[model samples]
Target chain A: MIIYDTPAGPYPARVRIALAEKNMLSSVQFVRINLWKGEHKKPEFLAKNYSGTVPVLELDDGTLIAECTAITEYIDALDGTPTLTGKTPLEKGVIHMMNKRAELELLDPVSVYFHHATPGLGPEVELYQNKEWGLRQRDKALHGMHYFDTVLRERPYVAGDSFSMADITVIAGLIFAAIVKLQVPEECEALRAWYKRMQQRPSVKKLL
Target chain B: MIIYDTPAGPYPARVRIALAEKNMLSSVQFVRINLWKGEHKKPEFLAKNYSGTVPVLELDDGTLIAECTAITEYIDALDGTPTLTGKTPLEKGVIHMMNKRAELELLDPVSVYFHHATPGLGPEVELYQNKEWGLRQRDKALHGMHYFDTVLRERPYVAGDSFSMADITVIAGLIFAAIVKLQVPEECEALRAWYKRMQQRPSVKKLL
Candidate 1:
């Protein structure tokens, strides 16, 4: 498999962590797409992914799969015995729910703030942006952080006791937060503690 | 099983279509949450789903599963054959990728437009809307329609030959568009044609 990604990007990092957890990091080839140069929007990259997004996985047979969660699902299911996604119906549901929450509530809003509110990707790439909207989303991102902090108060991981895609997503969100200098609220002790513990995991450590 | 949902919402309809496809419609109870009345935000509903989103599936054992995709995953896997989500690694990848696109490009933007630009659920529910951003998202929803139109030019379904959750998501997106009076572009003949066929399916027909 060949992964088309931008190094240090949160979405691509989510896929990388999943691959590492599956112990398949060395099995795949990484093709870098320079986001700063607008390489992703070029025709060659668009041929592989219509959305012109990063972290697209091209399988050996030439089937191109885009979207971070989709790539993670493919990588997680390759061994027949699923580990990162989940094993049962209930597990899958809860994990997916948490992972999506991590995206919508935290990661996506942070992205909007960066791209719209801040000087994101320069004037060429970011053609249109609404500062008012981006600022609103920045506030939403902070609210999302508090929401996750509340969730962490009850559990060790995002979904439950075990590490899963949800945890990877939260880690990625924090990575993005750090890049934008968006601090997790001081009151969110549980979330801060969870992040500290997550950093020690081998899958996270190698990628970081 | 008991489903917490509203009658006309797109996300809830996605789950309803999946239940119909899985032949589990009769197996579950439907509990209505009146969105216009702010019922979903009530303390009782928040206790079940902290996000206070619709289409939450409460399992027999009292496991409350939120998020449309997670609920669809649970329902698709309930029968063991797994028709909606996909049965193989490749299928799952493509289906999930398309489903996420359908959400990000189409359904989600339409939703944001509704809540932010339009009257939405009134001032109390839409307190933080940005009209400029919402309008920009409206343009994005149209672009998403065109993107899916391009995809349908090659395949019969959203993810490929067989109908899947991706199709369900597109159907739901159109439903929301219709509610908000967002027309599918006339140039997108393939998407419009596919939508027409999808409306004939028993699962979609029953829900409509």
Candidate 2:
């Protein structure tokens, strides 16, 4: 397998962590896509993923799989042992839902806000920034932060206790948000603790 | 199993359809959550899902499962049958990727835009909107729609040739959109055809 990867992006990180958790990182060849240079939008990359997204998995037979969750599911299924994505329907659903929430509600929007709002990445990486839009994106991240903080305050994990895909998705979002000088507030202690615990996993280290 | 559902919502409809598709609709009890009346935000509903999203499944053991994908997974798992989500790593990955793309690019953003942009839904939903923010969501949905159209144009099904959970998610999203006066263009022939085919499923009728 050839992994079309990028350093520090949340989507790619999700797959990296997934590979590590599944202990299959070494078996796959890694190829980096230099996202900062607009490589993803080029004709070559667009052929790989028309959506122009990262962390694509180019299968041995030459099929390119984009979508982090999908790639992870494929990787996990290769072993014939039910693993990180989930073992049962309920388990898979829980992880998928929570991961979706984190991505839809928290991570993706926040990253959009950060890049658009901040001076460094937005101007450097993307086009079409509206100051108003930037602020709105900031608010979006704050809303997510408040949400995850509150949810984590009560539940041990986003999808119950087993530390499934939700954790990986959340950490990716949190890490990306942090890259642009964003931090969870001190009041978000639950999220902080959960983040810390996730850090200890060797899988996480490999991904990071 | 008891389902915490909301009438005419995409997420709940996903469960409704899945339960029907799995031939378990009659076996599951459906309890409505009147989201427009602020029922979903109140303690009664939040007690089951702190995230406060609907289509939650309450097992006989009293375990609460939230999120449509998760709920569908659980329903599929009850009898250890061929999975509706997918059967192989590559297949699962493709299905999941398509599923996520649908949710992120189409379903969630369109819903957000609907709730935020449309009026007379009731007070709780009104709180979730910002006029300016709604526009952003609309843009996201359109961007998603383009991709949706493009993807379906290439494959016989949303994920691929096989009907899977990605199709289920799209049916729920588009049908909900139609009910709210948001229809896909005729130019998106494949998507329109796919939607028509999906609507023919007896399970879809039960959900409708």
Candidate 3:
């Protein structure tokens, strides 16, 4: 198995963390994409995924699994073990919903905010001078972050009690925000505590 | 099981179709929430679901399942004999990803367009009233239809050869659009053909 990945991007990092948790890190080969160099825009990579997204896993039979959550589940299924996603019907449904909520409402929004506000990743993403759309995405991100902070304040994790894929998705985005100097508001104590606990996981610690 | 549903909404329709496909229509009871009358906005319904979204499923044990997708999956998993969602990991991945894409990029934009442009759905979700935003959303929906049409031309179903939950979601949205007189363009021939074919399914026919 081979994974086309990048260190900083949230989508790929989700897969990486999941791989580490499953103890499959050394079993597969990683081909790093220089996201800073806009390598994903090249025709070679575009052929693999027309969406131009990262963390595409190439299976033994040459099947490409692109989406992070989907790839994670596929890999997890291979070992007949269900941990990060869910084991039963109710658990899977809740975890999937929570993962979607965090990805759409929190992680995705944060990236939009940074891409629109911060100067970094602009050139790579072809936002070189498109200030209007950039600002719009950023403002939307700020609104999303505010809502996310409030939601996190009430729940132990982004999805509630247990640690799951939602944490990995959010952690990846937060790390990217740190690289670009985006601030997590001081009043988001719950999110801070959650992040601190998430960082202690062996799978998470190895991402650095 | 009892479903708290609104007949005219797309989300509820997805669940209804799933039940029909599973041949469990008689197994479920219905409780209507008239959105036209603002019944869903009442504290009683709000207490049932924190998100306040419709298509809430109440099990015999009194467990409330919110989110139409989750509810649909829960109902389908009951017998577990016929896997309508998918069988293999690859099949499940495709179905899940396609459903998410349609819900986010197409179905969501259509709802946004309707709430913003049309007079119905009341004032709670009618924040974007500007003509430009309305026109922008209209374009988004049409473009989404075109994209969906193009995709169907390449495969019999959204996910591929077999029908699944993904088809039901977009079909529900398309039916809603047609009801509201959002007639798809004649140029979207593939969409028209596939939709016509989908309309013939026993489950799809029963829901309609």
Pairs of colliding residues, candidate 3: none
**Candidate 3 CAPRI level:** acceptable
Most accurate candidate by TM-score: 1
lDDT value, residue A33 of candidate 3: 90
Comparing 2 and 3 on TM-score, the stronger one? 2
| Error at A92, model 2, angstroms | 2.2
Tens digits of per-residue lDDT for model 2, B1-208: 8888876788888888777788887788788788778788888887787667787888888977777777776777667874678777788888887787778778877777777777637664566556555667777776666677877788878877877778888887787678677767767777777778877889787666
What RMSD does each model have against the real structure? 1.3, 2.7, 3.8
lDDT of every model, 2 decimals: 0.89, 0.77, 0.73
What TM-score would you report for chain A in candidate 3?
0.88
TM-score of chain A of each: 0.98, 0.92, 0.88
Model 1 per-residue lDDT tens digits across residues A92-160: 999999999899888988998999999889888888888887887888889888988988999888998
Best by DockQ: 1
* DockQ value of candidate 1: 0.79
- The sequence of per-residue lDDT tens digits that candidate 1 reaches over residues B120-202 is 98888666777887898899899999999989999999898999999999999999999999999899999998899989899
Of 1 and 2, the candidate ranking higher by DockQ: 1
For model 3, the local distance difference test gives: 0.73
